[PDB]
Design a binder for these strands. Structure first.
Lengths: 99, 335, 83, 80, 95, 108, 99, 88, 108, 93
DNA sequence: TCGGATGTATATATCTGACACGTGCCTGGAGACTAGGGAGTAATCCCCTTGGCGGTTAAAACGCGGGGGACAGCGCGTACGTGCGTTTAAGCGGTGCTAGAGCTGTCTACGACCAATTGAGCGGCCTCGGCACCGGGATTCTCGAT
DNA sequence: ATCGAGAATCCCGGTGCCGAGGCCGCTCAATTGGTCGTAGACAGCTCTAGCACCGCTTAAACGCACGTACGCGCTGTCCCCCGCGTTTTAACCGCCAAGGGGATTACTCCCTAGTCTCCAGGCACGTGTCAGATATATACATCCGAT
């Protein structure tokens, strides 16, 4: 019978190691493709500086991390530990993004 | 008590400003407290001295009106009398024991507020019972509760402003937030054998026999004369992370003690630090702590031992010194 | 030629990493899709501004300063890419 | 204090000059002390305290300068 | 055909750093962030000062409009210390 | 002092008083610019820069580093109560977040 | 035995009548005194235009009504009907006012 | 200053519990806990302290002794609280 | 058109092209102002004014009042999904709120 | 004395165009003036920033058009661009 | 379902003060003309963006077992809503006083502008040590079994 | 309570590489000096509107009593997230190759600022009347205890 960790300790392990670090957590090629897809929906035959895509990724990941902090607060308010889509919706509603 | 106007002035206040001699006499004989303070700190004596009503001053001082009590900016009645140039009021106040060497927050004696030679020479040297406990166990807590429900008194579990009586289990005063808040706000610190005493006698007997000497005694005396708080005029910057007494504990205790919490580190060679011209009232008369009132409080566990204890106007004090000052109600020198 | 369904390249592991940096211990299974939707909106709001700057400069390359201006224009000031 | 105090004066070079000045000393006396310590003529000196310039007539104590408090010295004639 | 030289506060930030911390250095990305910071605060203070001059029908930005903009923008102790430093620099300059 | 050395050294500053003066003159802020506006603004900017750099150097020493990286600027800004309020709506590239976990997620 | 309404119907009655109307809900003299007290803490011997105090009251009441809307949303999230101080704190935290 | 200084104090209690209840009813709140009122007062104070301090900061710059409605409007606009109907 | 009637009517507008031109010139926005910038800006301002005024007049008629008050402007702005996006951080004096009661609080 | 300018008569002319029979109160007209000034400041500030970014010293009508595209939400921006373009072509021609 | 008790909506007089319109005028906008520099256009250079392979391997995807957390039901007790009688102080109106906002007129000092000059600061070279990476030994959380 | 095995992370030392920190040439932007016109500082005067007080009316706040509905704790179930192992996909890195389009420069013209003259558009003020507020009376819809 192999060794096994209880559900929740590796999650805390990951919380600590991803709050210590500062790299980007999304893969770069898929995000670049997503950026180009949205851009082609706006204007055709666009080119991007690599710095432009890197700035977009910085902004997007900062936004998502902040939104997940607010989502966690909303989940803890409802006396829960799991974050649910309604927590995201309440956070966005209060920040003035959803209405 | 008695209702006041929006500026905090009691009827005795307004009578003192207006100089109504029959009104002040009638109010005084009716039980009106002469030692009341408005929202800025002025007593009726301050108003009488500032305007020049000699007879009002005499009636007030007759009715146990404290003469050394400090008003707004720690002005004293002698400060008001000398600043407006009323020689007879100065004579009366000195005859009634008002100190000529007291200072306000700016460290200016009444002499410094005048220039008249004669009065300069005269100035020159020629309530419901609120109960609360500190770390009491089950039987003690229940027995204070039963005393509360037989005396019809309000007992609290968390400390707040309107507390009057604080009960300590041991003989000495406990070094906990409960007793520290009690001593800073001047509450009655009573040993446990007091409360059971009432249960043994069924009477609200005397409490000066149950007051710890040289500890809460000085604080209670200081408050009963309406003098400033212990840390009046002192600024504190809390540097580092703390383990014994948390940051919130120290901040709350500082604020409740009359001090002010600084948010930036007090660089000694900075104009903001140098230009703080306040004076610590409860310091030694001639120590460095009168004008050097800014402290950097650090915990001994962090152990940032400075090369010099004081540099400029800024001391570097361990949190142990701060706690010891709070327990003893005194600004203990760091040198 | 066009690109499609690249939002699915923001995988579930990446969303859980972003949640872990946010301090999240447990994640419901319906979060990921929700998150992707949110991300799309944010991205569409920024790129639309960035491209609008790019068209005004009469450029055909979107520069990093277009993105910086687009983010600052909606209260998301970003330090480190110029400006 | 009130008998003898030790103050500092900061120069644009970054060096700190230590002066033993009486609390009742005038700014002219402080300029004379700086002249003795460094050789700078008083006419070239301007003293700054608390974002104000110090006048020659008024004394140190009336500017509320305590012990171990820092002044600033700027050259008015032939600086650099 | 010469390249266009671009300006930055890199040397000034480095001088300030070698004042406060004579031994530590700084990387290129940290200097980029510091230049962004200086530019951001410059436009904040200058825009507030411009609005202040427009409200009072003044056609000049003086040092007291910069002072009021500093008081409006920075939080408490920061504003107090920044006002102190600005005043000392202005008097040091005019004296 | 009214010297001729340079306006920065005349003011006692490291930041450029002349460059700040030009940026105020050409930035479309007002019709005129006083002679003491660039000095005051350069002094304020230098003070804020020194604040952030001192805190960041402290954070770099705590990590046993002798070179400031954006992580240390992030830590310095977010750990200061007033700098975190001045830069509340600012994201710092390659900066990360402050490590803190809500107390209800920790094991009992 | 007099007539009595169940707890909750008069509350809805008040909700409707205060959302139909547009007047100020705080008394004017107490609010003016509060404004002057805060101002005296900032600068001494200040005078106020009556329009200044009216603008301050407009802004304050609009702020409080919006904050109570967000507080009600936070209370409903926690599966409650009663608004509690923690709902106010969560709302202010998410709006970026509390941190 | 030779004359005394008189100050106001404890006027936040003039924001009574019925007034907070009316403000909650306009906000759609059906039921209110007893600890809201004190909480609300604290919140209000902070808001006011942030606006007044800016308004006075404008008033001092114009070298005025009267806080006009335009000072309040500017102070509100400065923190994303644009108010229509009092000027500007 | 190459007319000389007046710039507002020349553009076909009711808002003042000349006043907008002066406000642009003397507002510290740029060194120079193009000839067509005041015309474009006045046209946009007039369009937005007409949008809000039409919605507010509809609100006034629905309340069977023949005069617009701040309540009608508030209702118009908050009920349109884009005027509420443009004016979402704006409080309107004597405006009130949109009447909504969350479905949870209604009687069973 | 001093005379102060306002957009009251233009707002009233527009109102008489769109709703020929309704009137407007003094407070609603004050709110309308505040709205016009607010939007003017927004669009002119964005146009100024656009001209500064591209190192232009002139605010032309395409800076105003780009500012309108950046500030107004979708259909509002579409119709406002249409109105501005129509006005400029009618004025020039 | 059923009928009182109640709160809100609908209809009529009528009073007022605020909205809409008219008038004098004066200042700001418009028309004409001149000069100069901003911006449009053309041409060129070269950077840096896009596209393509090939390999390696880090990470994503999938599956499964199980435990812990979400959620529903239930009971209690306490604190909040509702209503009534009492008390407070807000609101209104009116009078009286004066500080200070607001405007006008001199007139001086400061900021713009222009020409000349020269040192500060930027771009390019380059070189070493700070930090990254790796590899082994040591310590410390973790968890299942007593 | 407690020890003990398995993982995870940290500590210490060795190697290397590339970017930070400093040097050098040069050029252009900041500094200096003089002139000029006007912005704004200062003094004075007007008159508005902010402040203070007083008395009366009554609306709203306050205190209290009662009851019930809702918050909160507890228990039980079950399902769905987590942890871990294995397989598969495609990210990432290194490389090379083209060429589009971003910068840069030179020239030129035409669009806008600046000045002056002139006059009507819009602002302040004065005045009539009617839309909306308020009082008064019923009528109907809603709530709730009791059928």
């Amino acid at each position: 019978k192999p060794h096994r960790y209880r559900p929740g300790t590796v999650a805390l392990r990951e919380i600590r190691r991803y709050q210590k670090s500062t790299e980007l957590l999304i893969r770069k090629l898929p995000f670049q493709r997503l950026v180009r897809e949205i851009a082609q929906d706006f204007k055709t035959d666009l080119r991007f500086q690599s710095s432009a895509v890197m700035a977009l990724q910085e902004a997007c990941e900062a936004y998502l991390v902040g939104l997940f902090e607010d989502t966690n607060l909303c989940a803890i308010h409802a006396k829960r530990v799991t974050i649910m889509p309604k927590d995201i919706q309440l956070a966005r509603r209060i920040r003035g993004e959803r209405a | 008590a008695v209702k006041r106007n929006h500026r905090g002035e009691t009827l005795l206040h307004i009578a003192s400003i207006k100089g109504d001699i029959p009104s002040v006499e009638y109010l005084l004989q009716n039980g009106s407290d002469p030692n009341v303070k408005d929202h800025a700190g002025w007593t009726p004596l301050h108003e009488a001295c500032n305007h020049g009503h000699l007879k009002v001053v005499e009636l007030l001082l007759q009715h146990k009106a404290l003469v050394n009590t400090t008003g707004y900016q720690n002005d004293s009645p002698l400060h008001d009398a000398a600043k407006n140039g009323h020689v007879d009021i100065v004579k009366l106040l000195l005859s009634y024991g008002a100190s000529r060497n007291a200072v306000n927050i700016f460290g200016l004696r009444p002499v410094d507020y005048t220039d008249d030679e004669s009065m300069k020479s005269l100035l020159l040297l020629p309530g419901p019972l609120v109960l609360i406990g500190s770390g009491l166990s089950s039987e003690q807590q229940k027995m204070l509760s039963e005393l509360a429900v037989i005396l019809k008194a309000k007992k609290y579990t968390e400390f707040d402003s309107t507390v009057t009586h604080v009960v300590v289990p041991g003989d000495a005063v406990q070094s906990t937030l409960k007793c520290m808040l009690g001593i800073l706000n001047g509450c009655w610190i009573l040993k446990f054998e007091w409360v059971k005493a009432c249960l043994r006698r069924k009477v609200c007997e005397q409490e000066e026999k149950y007051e710890i000497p040289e500890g809460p005694r000085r604080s209670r005396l200081n408050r009963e004369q309406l003098l400033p708080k212990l840390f009046d005029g002192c600024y504190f910057y809390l540097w580092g992370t703390f383990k014994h007494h948390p940051k919130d504990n120290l901040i709350k205790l500082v604020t409740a003690g009359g001090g002010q919490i600084l948010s930036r580190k007090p660089k000694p060679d900075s104009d903001v630090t140098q230009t703080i011209n306040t004076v610590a009232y409860h310091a030694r008369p001639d120590s460095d702590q009168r004008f050097c009132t800014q402290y950097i409080i650090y915990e001994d566990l962090c152990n940032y031992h400075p090369e010099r204890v004081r540099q400029g106007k800024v001391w570097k004090a361990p949190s142990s010194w701060f706690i010891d000052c709070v327990m003893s109600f005194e600004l203990l020198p760091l040198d | 030629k066009v690109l499609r369904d690249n939002i699915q390249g923001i995988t579930k592991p990446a969303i859980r990493r972003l949640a872990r940096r946010g301090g999240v211990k447990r994640i419901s299974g319906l979060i990921y899709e929700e998150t992707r939707g949110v991300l799309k909106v944010f991205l569409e709001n920024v790129i639309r501004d960035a491209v609008t700057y790019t068209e005004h400069a009469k450029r055909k390359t979107v520069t990093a300063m277009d993105v910086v201006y687009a983010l600052k224009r909606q209260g998301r000031t970003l330090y480190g890419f110029g400006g | 204090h009130h008998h003898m105090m030790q103050i500092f004066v900061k120069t644009l070079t970054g060096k700190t000059i230590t002066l033993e000045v009486e609390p009742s000393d005038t700014i002219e006396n402080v300029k004379a002390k700086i002249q003795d310590k460094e050789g700078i003529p008083p006419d070239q000196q301007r003293l700054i305290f608390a974002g104000k310039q110090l006048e020659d007539g008024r004394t140190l104590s009336d500017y509320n300068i305590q012990k171990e408090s820092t002044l600033h010295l700027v050259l008015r004639l032939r600086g650099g | 055909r010469k390249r266009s030289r671009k300006e930055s506060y890199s040397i000034y930030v480095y001088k300030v750093l070698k004042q406060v911390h004579p031994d530590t250095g700084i990387s290129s990305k940290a200097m980029g962030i510091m230049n962004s910071f200086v530019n951001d605060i410059f436009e904040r203070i200058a825009g507030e000062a411009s609005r202040l001059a427009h409200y009072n029908k003044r056609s000049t930005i003086t040092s007291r409009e910069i002072q009021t903009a500093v008081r409006l923008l920075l939080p408490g102790e920061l504003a107090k210390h920044a006002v102190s430093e600005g005043t000392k620099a202005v008097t040091k300059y005019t004296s | 002092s009214a010297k001729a050395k340079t306006r920065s050294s005349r003011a006692g500053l490291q930041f450029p008083v002349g460059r700040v003066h030009r940026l105020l003159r050409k930035g479309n802020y007002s019709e005129r610019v006083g002679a003491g506006a660039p000095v005051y603004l350069a002094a304020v900017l230098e003070y804020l820069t020194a604040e952030i750099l001192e805190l960041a150097g402290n954070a770099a020493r705590d990590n046993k580093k002798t070179r400031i990286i954006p992580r240390h600027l992030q830590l310095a800004i977010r750990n200061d109560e007033e700098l975190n309020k001045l830069l509340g709506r600012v994201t710092i590239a390659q900066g990360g977040v402050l490590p803190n976990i809500q107390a209800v997620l920790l094991p009992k």
